[PDB]
């Protein structure tokens, strides 16, 4: 039966900070290739020569971000297998940035020409990139807190997070609710709009970005579903840490609820 | 039963041509949007930094690509369903050039610094983009009858055909051939080394062409198998022209081989 | 059945120091036949004129070694039948440095250029060379706790300890591990890759440790196996001390893991 | 049952044939690369140092092999499934000298001092390579057909045709004719001598040579009488063109010898 | 049944000793016949020709005999029938003794011109013979003791005992240990080639002074197992004192091994 | 039964006279390493010393021998299987003069100072030579016919073939004529006297060829009895074609007598 396992879910939630962790130190190391990266006119993007720059549509894809979260937080909390759906969610989010790491290690693709004021840079050190790290690390990426002041490269994790709660928020409903659905789709469509008019990623940075995550949480789902990991030599799965994590858990979680407090 | 429908494989044949004319315009609209592409320094590689460029290196692509044409041929000439295989592979170089030129289109990622020699520019008027795209349709892109001078885009096409033509004659010979499959992928893998060693194109390009090619023939071969065109309402199939061309093949294509000239 | 015999494993230790001390003084006695070794001419290599040396490629060879042999530390201790597996390493340790020491006696093959620091020398008498085979004995052989002042001659050792390793981590896990198994595949790979990268050992070294390595462990474990020590006089097997060691042992060993401790 | 395929055995004749071009050729492009090969001292060896040079000692290794080619040729005479025979002795030379071709071609051992009047060479064209290539291929590398004038690499020759030769005697006579045998091994261990006592290969090199022809011999043989061929997919044979040529013959050949000529 | 009459070992031993006793005496004998002895050259041979006379091999002769020897004491102290080995073991002594006896009797055969540096000579008188005899008894005629400083005589007794104590080891332990056989024949055929290389003995002396020693061995062994001496009138034994010492023995001596020490 | 073979009897008789005629050609060989060989003074010997020297014993050995020859050609004629007989005789003179011959070859053993005036040597050719042993071959060996004019080393054929018809004739007479036995044992005897006392040969010499011989025709005559070269796998026979002559002769060949011709 679906057993709440309460001890593996601290290990996936280890999981995703260290890998935010490590993300963010290799961040820093990507900046110190190309000194200036600051004297490139913009190439032509017909989607960047379109819509002029917009200085505060960056924030809204922020608070669209929060309020998505503040809806997810709130289907996490009025459900009875709160455990599974708050490991899978770290789990899930624990291998796109790998992915993120793998591809800004292989090449560099950031924005040509804005956030110009760019402070800091010329770290010549073996402990001072640290420090850095902890400041990228525990500002969560918000300009809200800001620690986002220079140019972001390919593959934008905004975009991988705000489609990553959209889906579970609209997989774990019930299908006789279709009115938060496509709210939850337009902010999220918004948000990839207003991340796009703020001059601050490619069309093709957010294109693969979509696909990737898509096609992953759709490929985990449906091996969840069809429990092959246990059913024979399915795919010889590549997943960091998937048989550990849903071996306990068989066939599809339903979508019941209750009150989680003892005092109705 | 299996039937040759002679009057399909035409329609597909002009069908993948038509877009091999689309795709030849569209290198020619979108080459006139920088003026100068030869002044910038390029982007931060971990592959085009190390490794020297080979002047050399970009012919044996070529000739890796004829010596696989040759086997497709030669494998095409003794299969019964000669009419069936070529139908197929002109729907998928269809479908991956669309997307070729969708990516291209959407943005422009070039080698920033080879090919500084060559001539014509500012081709700004009606009716020599068109003289300069049939100059580019009938050279089949290839440098040794030389037609490419200046640089190249996104999403390479070398790349794809080299790797369509590697997992097509995979898969249409008996599963104990493993030998020829063994000696196209060392030079498919041949083949693509030589293409990053010639500075031609960046390391990311050459990635996302392979897997992209994989995944729609794989995914491509899958619906085939099981005949979900008809079976029920899948999933909505998006290639183009799906059911159409495929209607009248059920099951899983034979192996067998079978000689059509009647000179025994 | 399977008795665990703890006379024997120590047998089967004072047995490989022996050899390693045995080894230790031949490398020393070998180094005394032509003095210089330093004043002519690499041979015609095709790894070792292509690629310029890397001053801190040999010391990674040896970090991989370290890495596998803590991992190979780890499984020798959460398992039922560690005694056999101890014992089993040894016993192949020991021969295969047996054949290195007959190989490099036969002819004296090193490379003319590297470590040039090697000076003074003149060893003549019995009691100073002694104290020379000692210093690299209790040294491990390694470039770290520095001993490796002068060359290198056929049939490498750090070769030898790598596959050795790596193939005992492969076989003595379970069968549906397939990641750790790839983790020390490209471990193994890139030390081997760095002691040709380091101009330290011949291209024609490395293979035939490699082969030799493999091809030894492959018939130690099919003899073991076959249990053909006491099934008839099959063919004299020319293993040094092999049925006094795996006389006790009979059938395949299998995969029970534990934890010896006493308080679970 | 054994069907005499004729038309079998003349591809295999070309396959040599085409082999021993390329390996001569293959030798005449590895001389290039180092000009003198004859100003070094010899490496340090324990038996090219004791045993003085014999002038004479490189014709009688030439002499045996001349006798040992008779009395296989006696004997292929005789038999009646000669033509398994001839068709498995091509199949078997053939990889061995793709084996030696590639060894050489990685690292080039040579004997310092000998053949010391090989001058001339700057062969810096490709239509003189060509004639020596074919002055060394249509005189069969021997000595006494004078074209040995230069010098051999690693993987020595001759021990290869000599220990081929003898263990193809010794295979198909009946097993009761216990004085060919011996004289047979006497042979062969004598022409071993002989090429080491002239100062011509180095003791590794006709080692590993022997080593390499005993194995691939024996491991021929034991696949051929499995026959695995066709048993089960049970290794993936890596043998050129062995499935090609023993298809046909099941089981194991017998010792049936009688007369071809119809005139008693 | 096999009982153990320790009064024949005793007399066994005495007698042989007594053996001893008369080779010492009658090499004094034939000493005196020519008194120069070293002035006319070798007469011509193959192995004293060809290899040079090197002078430290001669005592490997003796290395080798007294590690044999250490192996054949080890023998006897572990086998149960410590008292029937020793007594054949003497009893074949006494005859290769006197035959070799016979031999220097009838003729004398030495190297003319080695050890040419001794001294002593013209022993004319009845007693000072004795003397000298005593000299050579007490000093079991090795060289390491020096006693044996002048030249040496027909049938070499190094091989006789060197061969004795192999056809012992190999023929009394059980039929499963064939690596100290192999080690023994090593052991021998090195003595056997020390003692030639050592210009001490014609390469005649060792042919039929192993030959002689292994043929009499078996002969003695054959006729010990099949009882023949109180079978019948068979063929009158010449073996001096046969019956006597064998009479109390019937059957075949077994191979098992006993500790006769009352301290486990 | 017993068929007489008239075909294989004048192979037999072909080898005995190529190996007469190899024994003649090595005889003339060992003449040529020493020139003098006759400045050396008689080894002592204590039956030489005691005999003066007779110059007429030569001619009555001979005398003997053809005595011997007489009738032992004398029971030749009047048998029933002559060719058996013929053939044995025939092939067993072939092995003994073969073992003389590598005695011959390994070492030189020749009486010093007798025959000081035979003409000849200092033969400088590769021709004459030849002549020399037609001469030697062409002559039997007797002094009645003047070949033999220098001296005989060890291992005498003239003792050899005394023995070996000696035997001959005593062996094929039923156990009834014990008065002709005699005479040929008493003629032996005088023969090797006269041999011993003609100073040609030494004790040493003609005691090992006697007892070979002796050794060699016992072996063959109760291997031939027993019929062990088809029974099972005996000894490993390295007999001279022994299968081939006595494979269609069975059991013991008795002697029964006939008259030869059609007129009695």
Same mark, same amino acid.
């Given at each position: 039966?679906?057993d ?5 879910t601290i290990?996936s939630c280890?999981?995703?900070f ?11 190391i990507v900046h ?6 600051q004297?490139?006119?913009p ?5 960047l020569d379109?819509?002029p ?11 669209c ?5 503040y809806?997810?937080?709130?289907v996490?909390?009025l459900?009875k297998?709160?455990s599974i759906l708050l /490991?899978?969610?770290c789990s @899930? ?5 790998? %992915?993120?790491? *793998?591809?800004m +290690?292989?090449?560099?693709l950031?924005?040509?020409?804005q ?14 990139k640290?420090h850095?790290a ?5 500002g969560?990426?918000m300009?809200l807190?800001?620690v986002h002041t220079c ?5 934008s ?7 990553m ?7 774990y409903?019930? /299908?006789?609710?279709?009115? @938060?659905?496509?709210?939850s789709w337009? %902010?999220?469509? *918004?948000?990839? +709009?207003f ?11 957010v ?6 995550t ?6 985990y ?5 069809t429990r092959?990991?246990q059913?024979?030599?399915?795919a010889?799965?590549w997943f960091?840490?998937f048989?550990?994590?849903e071996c306990?858990v068989?066939?599809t979680?339903?979508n ?9």
């Amino acid at each position: 039966r679906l057993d709440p396992e309460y001890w593996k879910t601290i290990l996936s939630c280890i999981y995703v900070f260290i890998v935010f962790g490590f993300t963010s130190f290799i961040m820093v190391i990507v900046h110190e290739r190309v000194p200036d990266m600051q004297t490139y006119p913009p190439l032509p993007d017909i989607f960047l020569d379109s819509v002029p720059r917009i200085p505060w549509a960056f924030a809204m894809t922020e608070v669209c971000g929060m309020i998505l979260c503040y809806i997810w937080l709130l289907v996490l909390l009025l459900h009875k297998h709160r455990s599974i759906l708050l /490991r899978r969610l770290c789990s @899930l989010m624990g291998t796109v940035f790998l %992915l993120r790491c *793998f591809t800004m +290690f292989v090449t560099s693709l950031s924005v040509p020409g804005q956030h110009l004021q760019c402070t800091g840079k010329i770290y010549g050190s073996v402990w001072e990139k640290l420090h850095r790290a902890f400041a990228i690390w525990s500002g969560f990426g918000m300009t809200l807190t800001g620690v986002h002041t220079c140019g972001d490269y390919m593959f934008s994790g905004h975009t991988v997070v705000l489609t990553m709660l959209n889906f579970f928020v609209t997989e774990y409903t019930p /299908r006789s609710w279709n009115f @938060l659905h496509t709210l939850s789709w337009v %902010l999220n469509l *918004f948000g990839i +709009f207003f991340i796009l008019a703020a001059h601050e990623h490619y069309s093709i940075d957010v294109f693969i970005a979509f696909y990737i995550t898509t096609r992953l949480f759709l490929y985990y789902h449906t091996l969840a579903n069809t429990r092959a990991y246990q059913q024979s030599r399915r795919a010889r799965i590549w997943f960091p840490m998937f048989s550990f994590f849903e071996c306990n858990v068989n066939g599809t979680v339903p979508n019941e609820y209750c009150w989680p407090f003892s005092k109705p």
